[PDB]
Amino acid sequence: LSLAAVRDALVRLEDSVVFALIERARHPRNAPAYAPAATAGEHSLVEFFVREAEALNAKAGHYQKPEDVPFFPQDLPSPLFPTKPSPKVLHPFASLVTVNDAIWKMYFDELLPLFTVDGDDASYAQTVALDLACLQVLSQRIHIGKYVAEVKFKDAPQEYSRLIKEKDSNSLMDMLTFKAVEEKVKKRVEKKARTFGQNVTLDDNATAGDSECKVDPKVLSKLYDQWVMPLTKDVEVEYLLRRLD
Amino acid sequence: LSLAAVRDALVRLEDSVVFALIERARHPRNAPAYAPAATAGEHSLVEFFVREAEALNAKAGHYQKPEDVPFFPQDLPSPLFPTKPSPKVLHPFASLVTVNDAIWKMYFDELLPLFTVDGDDASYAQTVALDLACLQVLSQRIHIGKYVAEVKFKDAPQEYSRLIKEKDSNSLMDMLTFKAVEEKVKKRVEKKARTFGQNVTLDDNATAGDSECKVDPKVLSKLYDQWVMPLTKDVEVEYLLRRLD
């Protein structure tokens, strides 16, 4: 709908990502929570939890907005409850894009080792809820790329449609990319990790660098640079390619 | 085992409470989520959701420590996964005290209006999940009172036992109360809301007041002074009244 409204939604999720990483970092790696199951049909604890959690959310009316995308879509029940009609702001077919399969692999294989200490407390059930909270914030921010794409498309429609007709993802990627905004996002996300992960005490005693921080602010910089922003841009490109259907 | 470790665990919960309130305030009141006639049956959307999410958590191994207390205990299932027996640090019978029904009442009746603006987006499923995270962090904080009661008992067991045998609630309450520390907590919990709720910006010159804070820092002071700290103390008095059984 609005250039500024979409940007505000993204900025606000910077705080939600810092928060969610800080809270999950309260526990160690807790690897038994992710160990796989002996059989098919039996799952790991984290998969069992998410599949069950997403079914409950679906009954409560979740996943009816294009930025709210589940990790396990096939099994999902209908909402049990009355649902307000969609605003319908995006191209419907281009809206069905999902990179959740990639967010999942990224979180467990690459993210978790960066902000989570080696070790094991018994708190597997608490841990997997905190993982789902991380996976959901990441996935909402990344799939807002659908609105980012629409908003850019409507701003320069003749220039974008020319590239869509020629199926030219590489040139679409270049036009989408605002590298100077990306560098601001990374610095601000670093500053947010510094502000929220700080040990707040009533004295304002000096601290040596980020050694006091619950999550290393360079991790937030690195997450955004390597995964969040590249996967959001993947979503815009996939959206834009379908935007003329 | 250590009173400093127990207070360190309660200090870390200060940030979790601020995060959870900030995150729930992303949405407005969304009252139909709590209205029982909005959904079929005598249950509201939030009550339905929490019952289902608690049964899921129980299956994942949750609610196996005395600080982890569910709002709907009567209906909780067994863990699907193996829980390895853990160290018995607390009195078994006195461990079972739960003030969760008072926490639930104060959250929906007293707290929600304070940090949640009037209005309605249809985001009911996100709201009720954000409400449960609030409820879970308040309950854990408050029921860590059990651990507080226990260390305070073991270090002065004889004068504590005599006040238990006499069933003296007011004198147990004056033994437990450290008003100077309560005042640190009220001011620090408020500083954390001010720090974590501000709009963090790449301007070092810029400063903003509590008007820009996502949750009024004074709401956090009030929360602790009115409900969190008294309810934690209700737990440790009711813990001690059973400590000789």
Angle, in degrees to the nearest 10, between helices B229-240 and B145-155: 50
Q: Measured between CA atoms, how close is B39 to chain A, in angstroms?
A: 7
Whether B54 and B84 have beta carbons less than 8 Å apart is answered as no
Give the residue on A whose Cα is nearest the Cα of B51: A56
Q: Measured between CA atoms, how close is A155 to chain B, in angstroms?
A: 27
Domain range for residue A73? Answer: 1-245
Give the residue on A whose Cα is nearest the Cα of B203: A188
At residue B121, the 3 state secondary structure works out as coil
B124/A60 Cβ within 8 A: yes
Joined tokens for residue B170: 């007011």
Give the resolution in Å: 2.7
d(CA A126, CA B16): 13
In three state form, how does the secondary structure of B45-100 look? HHHHHHHHHHHHHHHCCCCCCCCCCCCCHHHCCCCCCCCCCCCCCCCCCHHHCCCH
d(CA B43, CA B38): 9
Q: Which helix (H) or strand (E) holds A82?
A: none
Q: Which helix (H) or strand (E) holds B160?
A: helix B157-165
DSSP letters, A89-138, are -S-TTGGG---HHHHHHHIIIIIHHHHS-S---S-HHHHHHHHHHHHHHH
- The one-character DSSP state at A177 is -
Whether B210 and B194 have beta carbons less than 8 Å apart is answered as yes
Q: Which residues of B39-52 are buried (b: 16+ CB within 10 A; e: fewer)?
A: beeeebbbbbbbbb
How distant, in Å, are the alpha carbons of A6, B120, B170, B194, B215 from that of B198?
A: 20, 23, 40, 6, 9
B201/A200 Cβ within 8 A: no
d(CA A219, CA B231): 38
Chain A partners within 8 Å of B126 (Cβ)? 62, 68
d(CA A150, CA A147): 5
Count other C-beta atoms under 10 Å from residue A72's C-beta.
16
Joined tokens for residue B215: 């949750």
Taking alpha carbons only, the member of A89, A104, A204, A199 closest to residue A151 is A89
Q: After which residues is chain B broken (C to N over 2.5 A)?
A: none
A192/B39 Cβ within 8 A: no
Whether A64 and A86 have beta carbons less than 8 Å apart is answered as yes
Joined tokens for residue A66: 């294009």
Whether A130 and A224 have beta carbons less than 8 Å apart is answered as no
- Residues 6 or more apart whose CB falls under 8 angstroms from that of A46 comprise A33, A34, A108, A128, A131, A132
Whether A214 and A22 have beta carbons less than 8 Å apart is answered as yes
Give the residue on B whose Cα is nearest the Cα of A23: B16
Q: How many domains does chain A have?
A: 1
Whether B159 and B150 have beta carbons less than 8 Å apart is answered as no
Chain A partners within 8 Å of B68 (Cβ)? 126
Q: Measured between CA atoms, how close is B160 to chain A, in angstroms?
A: 32
Q: Which candidate in B54, B196, B212 is best for mutational testing of the A interface (most A CBs within 10 A)?
A: B196
A195/B195 Cβ within 8 A: yes
Chain B partners within 8 Å of A16 (Cβ)? 23, 26
Question: In the Cβ-directed half-sphere of A225, how many Cα atoms lie within 13 Å?
Answer: 13
A81/B124 Cβ within 8 A: yes
d(CA A54, CA A69): 10
CA pseudo-torsion sign A141, B16, B129, A76: positive
Q: Measured between CA atoms, how close is A85 to chain B, in angstroms?
A: 10
Q: Measured between CA atoms, how close is B161 to chain A, in angstroms?
A: 33
> What is the rounded end-to-end Cα distance, in angstroms, of chain A?
20
Nearest to A60 among B19, B64, B125 (CB): B125
Whether A125 and B60 have beta carbons less than 8 Å apart is answered as yes
Q: By a Cβ cutoff of 8 Å, what residues of chain A touch chain B? A: 12, 15-16, 19, 22-23, 26, 45, 48-49, 52-53, 56-57, 59-62, 68, 80-81, 83-84, 122, 124-126, 128-129, 133, 184, 187-188, 191-192, 195-196, 198, 200-202
Joined tokens for residue A114: 């960066």
d(CA B92, CA B98): 13
How many residues can be counted in chain B? Answer: 245
d(CA A141, CA A161): 25
Name the experiment that determined this structure.
X-ray
Whether A47 and A138 have beta carbons less than 8 Å apart is answered as no
Count other C-beta atoms under 10 Å from residue B104's C-beta.
18
- Residues 6 or more apart whose CB falls under 8 angstroms from that of A27 comprise A116, A121, A123, A126, A127, A130
How many residues can be counted in chain A? Answer: 245
Taking alpha carbons only, the member of B232, B191, B183, B185 closest to residue B215 is B191
d(CA A94, CA A86): 16
Burial of A64 (0-12, 13-18, 19+ CB in 10 A): middle
CATH code: domain of residue B104: 1.10.590.10
d(CA B53, CA A57): 10
Q: Identify residue A49 by its one-letter amino acid code.
A: F
Question: In the Cβ-directed half-sphere of B125, how many Cα atoms lie within 13 Å?
Answer: 22
Whether A175 and A159 have beta carbons less than 8 Å apart is answered as yes
Chain A partners within 8 Å of B64 (Cβ)? 122
Whether A35 and A44 have beta carbons less than 8 Å apart is answered as yes
Q: Measured between CA atoms, how close is A203 to chain B, in angstroms?
A: 10
In three state form, how does the secondary structure of chain A look? CCHHHHHHHHHHHHHHHHHHHHHHCCCCCCHHHCCCCCCCCCCCHHHHHHHHHHHHHHHCCCCCCCCCCCCCCCCCCCCCCCCCCCCCCCCCCHHHCCCHHHHHHHHHHHHHHHHCCCCCCCCHHHHHHHHHHHHHHHHHHHHCHHHHHHHHHHHCHHHHHHHHHCCCHHHHHHHHCCHHHHHHHHHHHHHHHHHHCCCCCCCCCCCCCCCCCCCCHHHHHHHHHHHHHHHHHHHHHHHHHHCCC
Whether A98 and A72 have beta carbons less than 8 Å apart is answered as no
d(CA B16, CA A162): 49
Taking alpha carbons only, the member of A141, A127, A135, A115 closest to residue A193 is A115
At residue B162, the 3 state secondary structure works out as helix
Taking alpha carbons only, the member of B149, B147, B169, B146 closest to residue B157 is B149
Taking alpha carbons only, the member of B79, B196, B89, B191 closest to residue B149 is B89
Whether A15 and A89 have beta carbons less than 8 Å apart is answered as no
Backbone torsions φ then ψ of A86, nearest 5 degrees:
-65, 145
d(CA B133, CA B138): 9
Q: Which helix (H) or strand (E) holds A55?
A: helix A45-59
- Residues 6 or more apart whose CB falls under 8 angstroms from that of A41 comprise none
A26/B12 Cβ within 8 A: yes
Joined tokens for residue A174: 């270049």
The rounded radius of gyration (Å) of the Cα atoms in chain A is 20
d(CA B134, CA B132): 5
Residue A61 backbone class (left: φ over 0; alpha: ψ -120 to 50; beta: rest): left
d(CA B148, CA B177): 11
Backbone torsions φ then ψ of A65, nearest 5 degrees:
-110, 140
Joined tokens for residue A166: 């020629």
Backbone torsions φ then ψ of A40, nearest 5 degrees:
-70, 155
B198/A187 Cβ within 8 A: no
Count other C-beta atoms under 10 Å from residue A162's C-beta.
12
Whether B26 and B115 have beta carbons less than 8 Å apart is answered as no
Whether B130 and B26 have beta carbons less than 8 Å apart is answered as yes
- Residues 6 or more apart whose CB falls under 8 angstroms from that of A193 comprise A18, A21, A22, A213, A215, A216, A217, A219, A220
How distant, in Å, are the alpha carbons of A12, A145, A188, B26, B207 from that of A9?
A: 5, 11, 15, 10, 22
Angle, in degrees to the nearest 10, between helices A229-242 and A145-155: 60
d(CA A227, CA A135): 13
Chain A partners within 8 Å of B21 (Cβ)? none
| Pairs across A and B, CB distance < 8 A | 96
Q: Measured between CA atoms, how close is B176 to chain A, in angstroms?
A: 23
B196/A202 Cβ within 8 A: no
Burial of B64 (0-12, 13-18, 19+ CB in 10 A): middle
Q: Which residues of A20-54 are buried (b: 16+ CB within 10 A; e: fewer)?
A: bbbbbbbbebbeebbeeeeeeeeebbbbbbbebbb
